[PDB]
Every structure is written in C-alpha cells, then in structure tokens.
Amino acid sequence: LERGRDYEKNKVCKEFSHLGKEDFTSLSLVLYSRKFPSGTFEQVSQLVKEVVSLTEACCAEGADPDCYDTRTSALSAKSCESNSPFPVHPHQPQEFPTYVEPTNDEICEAFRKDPKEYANQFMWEYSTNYGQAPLSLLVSYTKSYLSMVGSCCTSASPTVCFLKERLQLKHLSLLTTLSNRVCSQYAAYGEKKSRLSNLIKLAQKVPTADLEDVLPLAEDITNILSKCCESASEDCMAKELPEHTVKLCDNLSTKNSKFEDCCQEKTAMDVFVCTYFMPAAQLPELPDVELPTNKDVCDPGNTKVMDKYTFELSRRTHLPEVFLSKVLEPTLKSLGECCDVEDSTTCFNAKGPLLKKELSSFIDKGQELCADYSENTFTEYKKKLAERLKAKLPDATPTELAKLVNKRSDFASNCCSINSPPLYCDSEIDAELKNI
Amino acid sequence: DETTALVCDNGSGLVKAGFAGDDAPRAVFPSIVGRPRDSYVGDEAQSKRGILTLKYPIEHGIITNWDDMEKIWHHTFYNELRVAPEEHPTLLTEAPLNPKANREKMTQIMFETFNVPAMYVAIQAVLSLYASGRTTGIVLDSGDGVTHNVPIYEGYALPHAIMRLDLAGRDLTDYLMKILTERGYSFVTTAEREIVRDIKEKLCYVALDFENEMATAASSSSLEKSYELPDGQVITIGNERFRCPETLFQPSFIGMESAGIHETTYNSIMKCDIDIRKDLYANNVMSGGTTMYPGIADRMQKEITALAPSTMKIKIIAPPERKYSVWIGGSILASLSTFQQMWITKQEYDEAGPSIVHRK
Numbered sequence A: 001l002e003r004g005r006d007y008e009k010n011k012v013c014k015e016f017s018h019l020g021k022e023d024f025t026s027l028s029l030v031l032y033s034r035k036f037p038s039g040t041f042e043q044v045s046q047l048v049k050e051v052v053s054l055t056e057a058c059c060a061e062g063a064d065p066d067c068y069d070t071r072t073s074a075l076s077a078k079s080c081e082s083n084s085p086f087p088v089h090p091h092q093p094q095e096f097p098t099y100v101e102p103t104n105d106e107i108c109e110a111f112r113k114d115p116k117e118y119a120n121q122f123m124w125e126y127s128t129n130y131g132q133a134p135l136s137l138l139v140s141y142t143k144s145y146l147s148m149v150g151s152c153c154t155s156a157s158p159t160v161c162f163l164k165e166r167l168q169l170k171h172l173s174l175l176t177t178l179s180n181r182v183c184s185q186y187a188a189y190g191e192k193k194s195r196l197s198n199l200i201k202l203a204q205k206v207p208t209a210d211l212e213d214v215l216p217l218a219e220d221i222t223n224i225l226s227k228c229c230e231s232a233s234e235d236c237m238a239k240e241l242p243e244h245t246v247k248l249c250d251n252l253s254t255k256n257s258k259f260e261d262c263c264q265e266k267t268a269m270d271v272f273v274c275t276y277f278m279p280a281a282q283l284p285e286l287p288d289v290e291l292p293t294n295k296d297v298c299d300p301g302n303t304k305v306m307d308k309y310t311f312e313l314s315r316r317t318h319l320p321e322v323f324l325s326k327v328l329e330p331t332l333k334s335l336g337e338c339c340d341v342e343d344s345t346t347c348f349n350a351k352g353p354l355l356k357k358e359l360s361s362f363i364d365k366g367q368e369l370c371a372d373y374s375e376n377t378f379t380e381y382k383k384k385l386a387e388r389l390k391a392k393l394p395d396a397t398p399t400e401l402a403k404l405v406n407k408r409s410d411f412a413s414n415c416c417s418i419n420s421p422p423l424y425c426d427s428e429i430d431a432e433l434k435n436i
Numbered sequence B: 001d002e003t004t005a006l007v008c009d010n011g012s013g014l015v016k017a018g019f020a021g022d023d024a025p026r027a028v029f030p031s032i033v034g035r036p037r038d039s040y041v042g043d044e045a046q047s048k049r050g051i052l053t054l055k056y057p058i059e060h061g062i063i064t065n066w067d068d069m070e071k072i073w074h075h076t077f078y079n080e081l082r083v084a085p086e087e088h089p090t091l092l093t094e095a096p097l098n099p100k101a102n103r104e105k106m107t108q109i110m111f112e113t114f115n116v117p118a119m120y121v122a123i124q125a126v127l128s129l130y131a132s133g134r135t136t137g138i139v140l141d142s143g144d145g146v147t148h149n150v151p152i153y154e155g156y157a158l159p160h161a162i163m164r165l166d167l168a169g170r171d172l173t174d175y176l177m178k179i180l181t182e183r184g185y186s187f188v189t190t191a192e193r194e195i196v197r198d199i200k201e202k203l204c205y206v207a208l209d210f211e212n213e214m215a216t217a218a219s220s221s222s223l224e225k226s227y228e229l230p231d232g233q234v235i236t237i238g239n240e241r242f243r244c245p246e247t248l249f250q251p252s253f254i255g256m257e258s259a260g261i262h263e264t265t266y267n268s269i270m271k272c273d274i275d276i277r278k279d280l281y282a283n284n285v286m287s288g289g290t291t292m293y294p295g296i297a298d299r300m301q302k303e304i305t306a307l308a309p310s311t312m313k314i315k316i317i318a319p320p321e322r323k324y325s326v327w328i329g330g331s332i333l334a335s336l337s338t339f340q341q342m343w344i345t346k347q348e349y350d351e352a353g354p355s356i357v358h359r360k
C-alpha cells in the first residue's frame, strides 16, 4: 500500500504538478484548516505558505531527493518553538459551528474588494467549522461555492443567479454539512456507541416499527460512517449516504406519516436532511422494560438480545438520546462484569437490582431536567419552568429564581433534543444531574 | 422561444398573479366572491357590496370553499390576466402546513376544469426566501388574514418548527378603527373600513421603543400626520400611527393572549437544531403586506437581540418590494431552466390522478 518510504513526497509532488501551485495552495488551506479547528487564520496561513514553500522547491526535477524529509522535519521543528507561527495543539469535533454565511450583498462587497483574500478566509473559516466532513467534499464544496460567488456577484441579475446556483449546489452543500455533523457524532461516540445511538434515535422516530425494520438501518449508517468519515476515497460518502436514504425509505416509507412525507421529497439529500431533523415522536405509554436476564447477558452471540432491549426501552421512554446513550452503555457493561467473575447467579443478585434503580433514578431525573421542553414553545416552556420552580423553592428570591430559569432553560435548549451534541451534553448532564 | 409560465399567489386577502419572468405581479385584487344579496369576483364584488353577499374562500391562508375558489381562478385567468389557461404551465402557492387533501384538490381543479398543460404548488414562505437569492433562513410572512414563521434549510421548511399566529393586516385595520373612533371620530361602516385601511398603509409605523415614542406623542407633535377623507375633511393621526402596528408585538392590545411576532420568530428558531439557528438568526426575512411598516426591521432586530445569545449575528432581510416577495420568488423560480423538470404535467396527472403533487 503506502509502503513507499517516499510515498508522502511522491504523493504531494504528484498533486503539486497535477493541480498547479494555486490549487495546491487552496487544497492545503482546506486540509490544514480541518486539521487545526482552533487554528487562527494567521496561524493556518503561515503553516500553508510554509508547506507550499518546501513542496514547490523539493518537487522540482533536479531538487536533491534529500530535501522533502529535511524541510519536513525542519517544518515540524518550528512547531515546538514558543509562540510558533503555526497552529497550536494539546483533533476534536466542532459541535457548535460559528460560521455564518454573510448576506449576498456583504459577500459581493467583500468579493469585489479582494477576491483572493475573500476566498482564503472562506476556505479557512468554513473548513475549520465543518472540518469533520470528508476532505474531498470540503475541497469540492468550497471550490463550487467560490465559483458561484464569482459569477453571481458579476451577474446582471445577481439575485436570480444566486437562487439558481444555490439550488444546484444544494446536493453537495447538504452532503458536506450533513456528513460533517453525523461524522462529528460518530467521532464523539466511537463505532460502538454510535450504533447504539442510531438505533435509539431510529426507535424514537418510528416507535411503532419492528426491530428488524430499524436495526438494519442503524447498522448501515454506522457502517457508512465507520468507512466514509475519515476516508481518502473521493466518493465514499458521496456514494454511500444517498444510497442509505433509499434503503431508509424502502423500509420506513409507510410506517408513519412523518417518514412518508420525508420519503416524498425530490432528492436523496432532501430526504436525508428531513429524516435527520425529524424530532422524537410521541412515544407510546408502556410498562417498564426489565433489564436483560443473566442468561441473555452471558450467552454467546447475544447482540440481538441487547439490541432488542435498547429498542424496546427507547421507544417507550420519554428522554433525549444523549441521556439514554450515556446510561445504557455503562449499565450493560456493568451487568457484563457478572459473567466474567466466577459464580454468575450471585453477583447478578447484588449488582443486578442495584443497576435497575440506578437506571430508573437516572431516567426520572433526566425527565425532570427536560421538564416541559418538548411539549411547548421555548417561551411557554420558560413560563412553566418558572412556575414549577417557584413552587419548589418558595424561599428563593426573584433574582435567584431568575438565574435558575436561565441556567436550566439554556441547558434544555442544548441537551433535551434528539440531536443534542454528545461531547458537550455528557459533561453537562453530569454537572446538572448532581443538582438533585 | 415562447410558452410563458403563470404564477398565481392565492392570498387570504389579495391574490397576486402575473407571468414568470416579470419583476412584479400583473394583477392584484381582493380574494372575494360576491353572491346575489349574478356573481362577481375581486374589485367589482367590492363595488357592488350592497347588492352582494361577500365570501372569503381563503380565510387564513387556507382555501376553504372550492366553488368560490374556482370563481377566483377563472376570474384571474380570463378577466385579469386575459389568457387561455390551457396553454400556460401554472405555478400556485399555498400556506404553510396546508393539508395534503387540499393541495391535491388544487391540482385536480387545475387540470380538470382549466386544463393546464402543467403546474406546481409551492409553499408561500419558501418562495419569499428564494426571492432573496437564498435557500436557508427563517421567514416571517404576514398578510391580511394570517402570520407565519417558517424556518427553512436548503429549501426544506421544518414543519415542527412552523409557528402560526392568527393576527394579521385585517386585525390591525380593525384595531386602528377602534382607537381612531375612541379618539373622537367615527369609523364603523365598510367604506370607513377601507378608509382606515388606507390610513394604516400610508401613515402607520413601528416604534423602536414603544413607551418612549408614546410619551413623545403625548407630549408634542412631529408624530402627528394629516389625512384627507373623501369628504375633503382632514383629520390628524397621532400616536395611533404606531399603536396600531405595535399589536404585532403585543397581541394583547386586542385581547389576544399569544406571543408577538418577535416571540414566534424566536420560538420557531428554538425548535431547530442548535447548529443551524445561527443561519436562521442571520437570514430572517420579512414578507407580506403587514410586514410593510417602516421601522419594523429595526424593531424586530432589537427584540430578537434581547432574546438571543449576546453573541448571535442578527440580521433582518426586509426588501422594499416585500409586499410581493412570495409572488416574486415564484416568478424567479418558475423562470429557472432547472425548475422546468419540476412541473406536474397533464400526462403524469392522467396516469396518476391527484396526489401526484406530493414531491414538494
């Protein structure tokens, strides 16, 4: 494969020649920006100019072979110097993008003034914010976006040009931001939890479906993420993702009205954004689901057993996936310990009942934290919260009470939804759970 | 090089219709049908008010009387546009959350009674966004009979985030009548109704700071204007210029206990994923005639800024032609070469009956 020993050098040199200096630079800016999400536009540009410096010089026929490995190790050298011109590092997923595309007038204003400056700022700020998407997509989207801005900002009819271009960009734009989002989720959880999460969400979106209806979908999307997210293939995600919605609709098209509507959208990405944003449904009211039996827990090839538990529980529990995901994972791993240590029916008698209440408690507290959030508008949610809080802390002052409404409201706006951010809410659900 | 698609924006108070490619609607008339108090539609129904019984087939953005609706469409095709529907693909508009059966019925009527070669039904609010050369943002659409907030992502309007407010132009007109009458004037008849409607569109505005503006008026003038009635008698409008539009923000001025437009805009965004809210706050477009008040952009900007995280870029898109943004966005969209593959043909219809309109 990459056994090259010079693979890197011959890889970049090949790229340098095929793309030309300008495009190689643009490729590097995007590449290094997704690598250093917290990197400044000044730090990243320095690293890029350095990288393109040694690449042009050391890829030239005549250049001594000696170099590339030289200025490359020399390049990493400057990385240790204090206040180094390059991006700092202790690559984590960005759960809160701050990129905000300016108005068509602001875009064109900035583009007339200085095109290059504009293009680099756009590639850096965009890449650093949605760097979790495949490199080939970022480079592709980025280039297609600038092309649009270049022709619409000089058009006789800027507005109609933009609508037209934006509609044609739609596919790639979604493919890019969606893949960045779901890949960030996959990176935060890891293949194991990611699959659990996708099953939970699917369960909450189609409560009335069969396990065999959604389990396949949860496995597929996980497979795609595992394979495509950090893949070199220029078409892993581009090809896999839309193929996934076809299966998704083939299975769920007729299971409920929301999925039917979503499956009526025109294109594959139109359907994916629809199902991705779909909220947790009105779950059925059902008898608690008991924790898996000792035989189920220890038996070989018991995945199906654990999956059915997760599904059966998730479709009847009114709690956000971020909550359910952080509890089911440990609960099961704990119950799992009993199978190892000698004497099964014994440890499962001590740890078993302990885990039940611990899980039951955790859910009731979660359902308390997410009070009336799903049932109402934010505005109305805050009113109710203020009321139930005035009834629980009568001796509290209007200010303390006001401070509490905000903190809990803020927390809920972030962690009481089906697509609430994994990393952020995990440490946040803990700091908020101990407040009971 | 010919054919010419038709764009018909069916409103609760005014229907806007013209041709795709035009910068503005060719015709604009009231959504009313006059029955023998033998039938009239639009401006004429208005005139022969006395000897007619007025019906509004589109009360709150949603079509509720199909016989009258056909009356309106026939009228816009033959009298207003003076065209032959049989040879014009027609783009129709519908309210957010318009029931499936209703949409299918619009399709039925289009192909079966007017035999249009093709057609399409588009969500009014989405067209407003398109009219701005954008596909992502939150729209505040406010007409004569209904107000909506629609969050849209890459063309997709998030249904569960749609906010509907039963307060629009018609209500402001009615309120400005009450407070004008209270100030010692008489506005109650239907003709007086249209007079007040005119005062509202020419001299009303939204105050950046209600109270401050309210005291400034109660203290002196500068906030007083003169309006000439048909009598030739001229009156002066004071603080009612901003007290009227102020109800958009305070639905209680008319005893309605519901959130104001700044709050429905706020809530709509909050029903969306954290990572796209920024794109909603920075692309907040206003469309509809009741969105025409001067100062309303700065006011909304202010209100949302007090509701949102101090670090959010808040931007209001309020074009001067926003009274027709829906129609205009319909015109641009229907004129796209990429859109031509979106039409519903008479063939696809014959081979599938209604319901073929489901592809959004």
Ligand SMILES: Nc1ncnc2c1ncn2[C@@H]1O[C@H](COP(=O)(O)OP(=O)(O)OP(=O)(O)O)[C@@H](O)[C@H]1O
Residues within 6 Å of the ligand: B010, B011, B012, B013, B014, B015, B060, B061, B141, B142, B143, B144, B145, B146, B147, B168, B169, B170, B173, B197, B200, B201, B202, B287, B288, B289, B290, B291, B292, B293, B323
């Ligand atoms: N310049 C203006 N200032 C204030 N209000 C205006 C202005 N021009 C029109 N309007 C008002 O806005 C409302 C109308 O129009 P739109 O054209 O938005 O209505 P629709 O589409 O007919 O109704 P809806 O959207 O509620 O179903 C009317 O009730 C009218 O009084």
Ligand SMILES: [Ca+2]
Residues within 6 Å of the ligand: B010, B011, B012, B124, B143, B288, B326
């Ligand atoms: Ca309208």
